[PDB]
Amino acid sequence: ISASIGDIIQRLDVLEQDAQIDRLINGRLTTLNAFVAQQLVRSESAALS
Amino acid sequence: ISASIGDIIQRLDVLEQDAQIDRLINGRLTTLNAFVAQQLVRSESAALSAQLAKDKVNECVKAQSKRSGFCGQGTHIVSFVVNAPNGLYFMHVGYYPS
Amino acid sequence: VTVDCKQYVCNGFQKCEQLLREYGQFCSKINQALHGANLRQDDSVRNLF
Amino acid sequence: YVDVGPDSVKSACIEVDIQQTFFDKTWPRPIDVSKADGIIYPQGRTYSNITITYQGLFPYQGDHGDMYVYSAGHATGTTPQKLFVANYSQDVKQFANGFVVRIGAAANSTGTVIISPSTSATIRKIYPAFMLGSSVGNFSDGKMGRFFNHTLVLLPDGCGTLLRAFYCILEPRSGNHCPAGNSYTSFATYHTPATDCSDGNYNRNASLNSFKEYFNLRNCTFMYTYNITEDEILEWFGITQTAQGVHLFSSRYVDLYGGNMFQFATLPVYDTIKYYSIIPHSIRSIQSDRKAWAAFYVYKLQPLTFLLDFSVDGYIRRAIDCGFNDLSQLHCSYESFDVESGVYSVSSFEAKPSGSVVEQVECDFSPLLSGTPPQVYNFKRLVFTNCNYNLTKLLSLFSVNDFTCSQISPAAIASNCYSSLILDYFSYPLSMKSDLSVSSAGPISQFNYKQSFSNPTCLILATVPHNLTTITKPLKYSYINKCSRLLSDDRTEVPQLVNANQYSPCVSIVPSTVWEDGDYYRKQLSPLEGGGWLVASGSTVAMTEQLQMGFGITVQYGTDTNSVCPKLKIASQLGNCVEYSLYGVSGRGVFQNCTAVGVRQQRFVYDAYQNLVGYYSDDGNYYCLRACVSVPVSVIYDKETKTHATLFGSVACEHISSTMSQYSRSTRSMLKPVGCVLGLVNSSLFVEDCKLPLGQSLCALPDTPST
Amino acid sequence: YVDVGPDSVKSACIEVDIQQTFFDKTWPRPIDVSKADGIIYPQGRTYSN
Amino acid sequence: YSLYGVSGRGVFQNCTAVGVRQQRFVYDAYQNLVGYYSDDGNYYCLRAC
Amino acid sequence: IADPGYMQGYDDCMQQICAQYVAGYKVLPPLMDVNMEAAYT
Numbered sequence A: 001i002s003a004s005i006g007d008i009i010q011r012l013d014v015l016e017q018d019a020q021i022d023r024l025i026n027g028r029l030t031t032l033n034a035f036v037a038q039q040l041v042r043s044e045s046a047a048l049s
Numbered sequence B: 001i002s003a004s005i006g007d008i009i010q011r012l013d014v015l016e017q018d019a020q021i022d023r024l025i026n027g028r029l030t031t032l033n034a035f036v037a038q039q040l041v042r043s044e045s046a047a048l049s050a051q052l053a054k055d056k057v058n059e060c061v062k063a064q065s066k067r068s069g070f071c072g073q074g075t076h077i078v079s080f081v082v083n084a085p086n087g088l089y090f091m092h093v094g095y096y097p098s
Numbered sequence C: 001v002t003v004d005c006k007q008y009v010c011n012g013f014q015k016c017e018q019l020l021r022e023y024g025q026f027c028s029k030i031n032q033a034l035h036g037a038n039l040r041q042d043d044s045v046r047n048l049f
Numbered sequence D: 001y002v003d004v005g006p007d008s009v010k011s012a013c014i015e016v017d018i019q020q021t022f023f024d025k026t027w028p029r030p031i032d033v034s035k036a037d038g039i040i041y042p043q044g045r046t047y048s049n050i051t052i053t054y055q056g057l058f059p060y061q062g063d064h065g066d067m068y069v070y071s072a073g074h075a076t077g078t079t080p081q082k083l084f085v086a087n088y089s090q091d092v093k094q095f096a097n098g099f100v101v102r103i104g105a106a107a108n109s110t111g112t113v114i115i116s117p118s119t120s121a122t123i124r125k126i127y128p129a130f131m132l133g134s135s136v137g138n139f140s141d142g143k144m145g146r147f148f149n150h151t152l153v154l155l156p157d158g159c160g161t162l163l164r165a166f167y168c169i170l171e172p173r174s175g176n177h178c179p180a181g182n183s184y185t186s187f188a189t190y191h192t193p194a195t196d197c198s199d200g201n202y203n204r205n206a207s208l209n210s211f212k213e214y215f216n217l218r219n220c221t222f223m224y225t226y227n228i229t230e231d232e233i234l235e236w237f238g239i240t241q242t243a244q245g246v247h248l249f250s251s252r253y254v255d256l257y258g259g260n261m262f263q264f265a266t267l268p269v270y271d272t273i274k275y276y277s278i279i280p281h282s283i284r285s286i287q288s289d290r291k292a293w294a295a296f297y298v299y300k301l302q303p304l305t306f307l308l309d310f311s312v313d314g315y316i317r318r319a320i321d322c323g324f325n326d327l328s329q330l331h332c333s334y335e336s337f338d339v340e341s342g343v344y345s346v347s348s349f350e351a352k353p354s355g356s357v358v359e360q361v362e363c364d365f366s367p368l369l370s371g372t373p374p375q376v377y378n379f380k381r382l383v384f385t386n387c388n389y390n391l392t393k394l395l396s397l398f399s400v401n402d403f404t405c406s407q408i409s410p411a412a413i414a415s416n417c418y419s420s421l422i423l424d425y426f427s428y429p430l431s432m433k434s435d436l437s438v439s440s441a442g443p444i445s446q447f448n449y450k451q452s453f454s455n456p457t458c459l460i461l462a463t464v465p466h467n468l469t470t471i472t473k474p475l476k477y478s479y480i481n482k483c484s485r486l487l488s489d490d491r492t493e494v495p496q497l498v499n500a501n502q503y504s505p506c507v508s509i510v511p512s513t514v515w516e517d518g519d520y521y522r523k524q525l526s527p528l529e530g531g532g533w534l535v536a537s538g539s540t541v542a543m544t545e546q547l548q549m550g551f552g553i554t555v556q557y558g559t560d561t562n563s564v565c566p567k568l569k570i571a572s573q574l575g576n577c578v579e580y581s582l583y584g585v586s587g588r589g590v591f592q593n594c595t596a597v598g599v600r601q602q603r604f605v606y607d608a609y610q611n612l613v614g615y616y617s618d619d620g621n622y623y624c625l626r627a628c629v630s631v632p633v634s635v636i637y638d639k640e641t642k643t644h645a646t647l648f649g650s651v652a653c654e655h656i657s658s659t660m661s662q663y664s665r666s667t668r669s670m671l672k673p674v675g676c677v678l679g680l681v682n683s684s685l686f687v688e689d690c691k692l693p694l695g696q697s698l699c700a701l702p703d704t705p706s707t
Numbered sequence E: 001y002v003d004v005g006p007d008s009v010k011s012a013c014i015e016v017d018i019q020q021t022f023f024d025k026t027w028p029r030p031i032d033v034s035k036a037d038g039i040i041y042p043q044g045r046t047y048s049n
Numbered sequence F: 001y002s003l004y005g006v007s008g009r010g011v012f013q014n015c016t017a018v019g020v021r022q023q024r025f026v027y028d029a030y031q032n033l034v035g036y037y038s039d040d041g042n043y044y045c046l047r048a049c
Numbered sequence G: 001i002a003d004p005g006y007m008q009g010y011d012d013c014m015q016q017i018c019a020q021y022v023a024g025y026k027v028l029p030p031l032m033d034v035n036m037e038a039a040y041t
Helices: A014-048 B017-062 C014-021 C024-048 D206-214 D326-332 D391-397 D410-415 D430-435 D443-448 G009-014 G034-040
Strands: B076-078 D016-018 D051-058 D066-068 D083-085 D099-103 D110-112 D120-124 D130-133 D136-138 D144-147 D150-157 D162-172 D189-191 D215-227 D235-242 D245-250 D262-267 D275-278 D281-283 D296-300 D302-310 D316-321 D343-345 D380-385 D399-406 D420-427 D457-463 D476-485 D520-524 D533-542 D548-556 D634-636
Touching (some): A014 C014, C014 C024, C014 D302, C024 D343, D130 D144, D144 D275, D206 D215, D215 D262, D302 D326, D316 D326, D326 D343, D391 D410, D399 D410, D399 D430, D430 D443, D430 D457, D443 D476
Antiparallel strands (some): D066 D296, D099 D235, D099 D296, D130 D275, D136 D144, D150 D162, D235 D245, D302 D316, D343 D634, D380 D420, D399 D457, D420 D548, D457 D548, D476 D533, D520 D533
């Protein structure tokens, strides 16, 4: 459930709110870490070129 | 729950012990597999740079090499090779007009 | 490009910021990694010219 | 309960003179975490020469805290008279996460006697006293500062040679100047040095006795004493609370000469401390014996990440408050007091919501109250578009027995604006609560009533009182316990599960109320209908004293055709910055009168994602929205000369303000204008050409040397 | 329930002649979505260019 | 060894001299303990297996 | 290129890519002004 904050107020109870939000942080930060690995790839290939 | 064994001996359950441990094995081995992919990356780039070093020894170290940087910054004269940690290391002796 | 994590995730909401503070190592390694990437790229620009 | 010694036998209290202006001084001693001011050592484990970033309870860098001073009382040449105090007893503070205290810092220096400002004296350390508790209010004469029920008192005694900690009910006494008596101003404690602090015979109960004059101590669960060696050394005291009780910290026993605080007690106080006050002390000296007593300073604790520098011997002599500014962040966000010299990007600075636009009368719950709620399998559906709802109104009629939601909370579902609110209601027994669940495969979800899993949902169990009389009860509660058809015999038989928002296929053959528990229904199918048979079986539960009902709510949660708003100038135009709150969706935007792209019949416009860019709703114009304003700040650290310099990303020399108050995060607690070649910088000066070039080599072309 | 006006007072219905072969014609008008035949606009939100 | 609430497998040695000495472990920037305390009263610094 | 903003493009997009509006991500400038890369070449 990803309306940019997981059940911040209306969309779920605060105690679970942490459950859906922690899904969104583990996922969103993990994909951000994929972006960082990608920047290291195109940075190294850019330095080769 | 990751006290180096999920529910090591000291805490419960015995039934759910395989559940938390299988979390820790899927995760820990998956991140180990990320380490293996990383070693393949830096190994392949290390072999590219090692082939570059062979291209720097056969050109800049034996011969002169009448070419610019690679043989860094100036009309190149001598170059020396010493083993560095994990790599070679060059002491390119170039000219500098000024 | 550098991401300003701890405010990318999350959008700036305090409970989600605390759930980031649980992951305060990963964000530091993100922005540390990109700042390293930009110094390598910037030394490629500088050393190039 | 514990014997804490006899009540006071005095029939009056010592008169107290409150003169706050004599205690209003500026003697700043702000937190400097560079010197490890205000640091509690970590509880979980302890460490050697290691540095680290660590999240725990700390005071913030530069916090001036709250200053308190105790004074000599009034006196003639021979006789102590009225006490002389500040207004501290009426100043009740919120405990929150607790606090740390700088004690005795000015000891040995020369300072004023307070009650006689023209008289100076050598400053001596004095210990603070605190009253803490869970419930506060006013004394009988209306003055603030009364603590109710069990109260924690921390009271030094014996001329600064012990701390007493006790947890009692404080019964205010009724003599003159006492808190339940006439002529009450403030309570206080005192001691009388001429008789209480004579060599070799300190009165270890002097302050306690003075306290007992203002309050009788009742039902004390504990009274502990902690001995203190007499000296004039600076020290730190701290207090926190967990479910384990109240934790006391001091530098005295483990780091007397360095100031690190370590735990020395856990008090069995399990009622959460919400409030505290500083108990004023006045020293009943005679005029020729007047001393100056060191101010003490209280700093609130909060969860912060610090970079902690541990010496070889394990103590912390250096720290950095990472959130203090971008420079500290860089130093830290790296786990080092030192951060190599360069440009380091610290986050925004997002603007503050102002002019919260709300767009949407009164939702019609009528036909629910009039008649007989049908059976669960014949649930009636109320649809809600474009109206205001008082739902806590509706749920105040009934007695409510259970409230669970999925992908939302009951708190949230009252507050948020949903364009479509569907309300489903029916008769339903409380006995069958375990079968009315979003996570249930009973007959109810199988054959009777199923909510959508794609929208947020709530499920309410209630009881109509007696007070409600227009709601009639039926013969009994009924539900379907089987709905299935075998087939033309073939090779298989199946059980039918209804999609959310539909009735059972068996409602055509199951009566509106089941006549008897276990009755079964059948109906042969036409060759077109598939052949074979349709079959069902009904169950009953006995009717209750008061009728019991079930409510199912579903909110959308669907971007368009959303209107519904709650019921309660500024919530309209021209809120030409953040924020809005449309019935359809939340969000933070900068509306502008733009042109002209949309549908114009339903009232949003998206751009290929979840976002809305963004007009509608206003009546009727094009208020196209945008994303939030963020100032993309950075830090120009230069560790050689230790001179940070905050750079903004690309805006603006004109739009910013110094220590900007329209924006959220420095980051975070505290901040600290020349451009404009790149962006705006909080660093002088203009070019200044041309050198050299080298690092630390900022953006487009400021090459920025130092200093 | 709603008042929908009076029942018919007629005692018979108009006779109906069913002749399907007169209605069997080939007049093809197939969906061409290139021209946006048969398109319901999305309910959830609405969009520009 | 098997100490108070902590398990583990280590090689204790009489080492010197870094710690807190009031509470009785010492960690090194991770979950591990390197490692003295508890003995009465000396420095039995532990190691990995 | 829909980018960049250096004290005219932030405000120019504010008058209305979003390296300066999500924040979020953020694009840094390329170490050299265009007149100076032009000076090198």
